[PDB]
């Protein structure tokens, strides 16, 4: 197994790595909507969902996989009242990559790192 | 890898599939207590826990596995004060299937889809 | 696949096992900061984080692996305001084991079993 490290997702400053490549299975850390170019977080929940998904994509692609290889996500949100918006963005993201939708779990948590509105972790497979 | 799709669990309307069959490992989406026959959610927390477990079972069985093949679950609840009840139902469900209990994580979240009281995701293996 | 059962982590009284050994992959149950020798929970959040990590370590080691084989954790906390402290302890724990940091997801939940401040689940691999 090996660490996945890419400039295309926010740098792993704390005691974690961006993701792990286990051979057939890749697992990402929970991605928050931090822009890897600027370090900023967009205000808009739809934009946050998209930034988190782009961060997941960067890690999966750094391991040689595609968005279409993602088979399971967990989506942690700060407010389920914004879920229609998140769902629309999430759906669009997968559609843009001609990807079958992953299996998913979705819950509203009390708070997320940096007070973001969403955090998404993903599992992808080579086969 | 392939999608698991069964009439025996609530249809996957949003941007997700019910579960994924990765070869040896099967992963389900987080199941909420929606009845696949009627679309209704039972009021009772014990009944909700059982409906979620039945939904997990439907997906695992659609992949050719048994409840006894489930090795890890995550149980998200709306209120840990109802956990004795949930635990009793969960225990009964596994016992009914002559199944070794899976590894498990349990947390109280702020809110769940459709305001349900429980959501359960599961991992099962063929070997 | 087989159950992992060790006297070195709190006994699995409810309907769960401490962890599962799936061959290459080991998955633990969500560990809470209960001391396996006394059954008590330390007051201090740093001490709680360390007790949870020690419990994870006991299960991983019972399967023949090391802390350095842990590749993904999920850390559920009661209060993200205590996260700097948790992070410091978590970092120290991995460093003490000369371990590459795992991938990680971190969220604040509404409540945890026994009103603890942290629960940590982990995935480790042999290869």
Curated annotation (Swiss-Prot), chains A, B, C:
InterPro entries the record matches: RidA (IPR006056), RidA_CS (IPR019897), RutC-like_sf (IPR035959), YjgF/YER057c/UK114 (IPR006175)
Catalyzed reaction equations: 2-iminobutanoate + H2O = 2-oxobutanoate + NH4(+); 2-iminopropanoate + H2O = pyruvate + NH4(+)
The name this protein goes by in its record: 2-iminobutanoate/2-iminopropanoate deaminase
Regions annotated as coiled coil: none
Top-level taxonomy: Bacteria, Pseudomonadati, Pseudomonadota, Gammaproteobacteria, Enterobacterales
Family: Belongs to the RutC family.
Function: Accelerates the release of ammonia from reactive enamine/imine intermediates of the PLP-dependent threonine dehydratase (IlvA) in the low water environment of the cell. It catalyzes the deamination of enamine/imine intermediates to yield 2-ketobutyrate and ammonia. It is required for the detoxification of reactive intermediates of IlvA due to their highly nucleophilic abilities. Involved in the isoleucine biosynthesis.
EC number(s) on file: 3.5.99.10
Localization per Swiss-Prot or TrEMBL: Cytoplasm
Chain positions recorded as substrate binding sites: 104
Site (Stabilizes the substrate): 16
EC top class, as a word: hydrolase
Main location group: cytoplasm
UniProt keyword terms in alphabetical order: Amino-acid biosynthesis, Branched-chain amino acid biosynthesis, Cytoplasm, Detoxification, Hydrolase, Isoleucine biosynthesis
Gene Ontology CC entries for this record: cytosol
Assembly description: Homotrimer.
Pathway of action: Amino-acid biosynthesis; L-isoleucine biosynthesis; 2-oxobutanoate from L-threonine
Transmembrane segments: none
Residues of the site described as Important for catalytic activity at high pH: 119
GO molecular function terms noted in the UniProt entry: 2-iminobutanoate deaminase activity; 2-iminopropanoate deaminase activity
Pfam families named among the record's database cross-references: Ribonuc_L-PSP
GO terms under biological process: isoleucine biosynthetic process; response to toxic substance
Catalytic residues (positions): 106
PANTHER family, per database record: 2-IMINOBUTANOATE/2-IMINOPROPANOATE DEAMINASE RIDA, 2-IMINOBUTANOATE_2-IMINOPROPANOATE DEAMINASE
